[PDB]
Design a protein around this ligand. Structure first.
Ligand SMILES: C[N+](C)(C)[C@@H](Cc1cnc[nH]1)C(=O)O
Ligand code: NA
Ligand code: NI
Length: 405
């Protein structure tokens, strides 16, 4: 369980016995409910509760969706023990909630529709979470200590899914100005030498859970490189803004210039000018910017444009994964980091039972690697592939740079 690829929670969730997965499910639910109570403390109980935006979902919808997904792949799943060989579309038991599928299945309930749904109230939503988890843990307790990877697959999957939605709660709270009880400085900007080598990129078979987009592992050639030891700080990033870099379209790509054309505010989000200085928004509060913090809420175009101005580039996801795994002193986990790699399948990819996790998003999404401060330690992993459209700035995204010698 001790590795440089992730914290012990991450390896215990992916490969550990039922006791470890049980611990992960309880910890995930504790986090989910604490975030839910922090949203409730700001918003109260009205539904939908929040104004509309494409990158938000109504708080009670997120809670129900977390329960719905767990119940879909555990309690209602008639082929749990088959793991990745489960037939996605087999007929399942009915949910505790008759309208659950019509409300919480995201591939069926169009986004704008969610704001008008007659969802269960705040307390009935928590009852649904409670009962589904009680059922989940009871089925988990039937597994023996040496339970096979196939027997534990969906218990690991639903735990990781809830972790992803907790992080979404954290960055949606930033958008909404909601302060959280669970809620950033970097150390020295430095350069590290990555020598030429071979990397066996992706997840192997002996280890337990892998996301489908991590398969199959394959060899990749890594060229000699000098790579930042940490994400780009504000002190490093902001001279680009000060040199009028946002008013100089030569620094930007085709899609970057397009995106920059529509931009009302020509600097990173959640920043604002204050005299000759800067303020940054955090927990709905504006505070003087810390230059030694990581630059955050930048999109792929902003990261690439800084790189062109600086004469550097983004790493490929292979270069990133190699450095994270082989270079002590390469520090990650403060912000997700845009790479230069589009989200594409590895050689031998095959979609897993939750078929819509990766495959619909190839090509239109850019890979980010690492983790941010709001990523659960049970999820954060040097082989994990995050994927968002290159324009997104609501997520906790930044970057690091590199250049060949
Ligand atoms: C892996 N990311 C974070 C890109 C996913 C996580 C996810 C949550 N429920 C389904 N998938 C996303 O935002 O769609
Ligand atoms: Na490290
Ligand atoms: Ni989801």
């Amino acid at each position: 369980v001790y590795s440089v690829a992730g914290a012990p929670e991450a390896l215990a969730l992916r490969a550990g016995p039922p006791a470890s997965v049980r611990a992960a499910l309880l910890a995930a639910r504790r986090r989910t409910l604490d975030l839910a109570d922090d949203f409730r403390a700001a918003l109260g109980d009205a539904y939908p509760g929040i104004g509309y935006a494409p990158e938000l979902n109504p708080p009670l919808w997120e809670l129900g969706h977390v329960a719905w997904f767990q119940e879909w792949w555990i309690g209602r799943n008639r082929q749990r023990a088959r793991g990745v060989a489960c037939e996605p579309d087999h007929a399942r038991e009915p949910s505790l909630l008759p309208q659950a599928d019509a409300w919480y299945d995201s591939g069926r309930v169009a986004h704008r529709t969610r704001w008008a749904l007659p969802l269960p109230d705040a307390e009935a939503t928590r009852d649904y979470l409670e009962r589904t988890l009680a059922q989940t843990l009871a089925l988990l307790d039937e597994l023996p200590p040496d339970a096979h990877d196939d027997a534990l697959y969906f218990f690991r999957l639903v735990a990781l899914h809830e972790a992803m939605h907790a992080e979404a709660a954290a960055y949606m709270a930033e958008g909404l100005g909601i302060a959280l009880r669970e809620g950033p400085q970097l150390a020295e900007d430095a350069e590290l030498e990555l020598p030429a080598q071979r990397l066996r990129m992706g997840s192997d078979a002996g280890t337990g859970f892998a996301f489908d987009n991590e398969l199959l592992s394959h060899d990749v050639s890594i060229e000699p490189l000098r790579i930042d030891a940490q994400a780009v700080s504000w002190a490093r990033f902001l001279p680009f803004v000060e040199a009028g870099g946002y008013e100089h379209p030569a620094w930007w790509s085709d899609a970057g210039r397009d995106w920059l054309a529509r931009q009302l505010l020509r600097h990173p989000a959640h920043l604002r000018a204050a005299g000759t200085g800067w303020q940054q928004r955090r927990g709905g509060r504006w505070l003087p910017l810390d230059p030694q913090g990581a630059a955050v809420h930048l999109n792929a175009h902003e990261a690439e444009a800084w790189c062109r101005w600086a004469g550097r580039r983004l790493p490929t996801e292979a270069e990133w994964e190699c450095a994270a795994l082989t270079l002590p002193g390469f520090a990650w986990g403060r912000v997700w980091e845009w790479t230069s790699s589009p989200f594409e399948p590895y050689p031998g990819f095959a979609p897993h039972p939750y078929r819509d996790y990766s495959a619909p998003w190839f090509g239109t999404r850019r890979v980010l690697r690492g983790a941010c401060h709001a990523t659960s330690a049970a999820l954060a992993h040097a082989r994990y592939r995050n994927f968002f459209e290159p324009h997104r700035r609501d997520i906790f995204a930044g970057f690091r740079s590199c250049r060949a010698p």
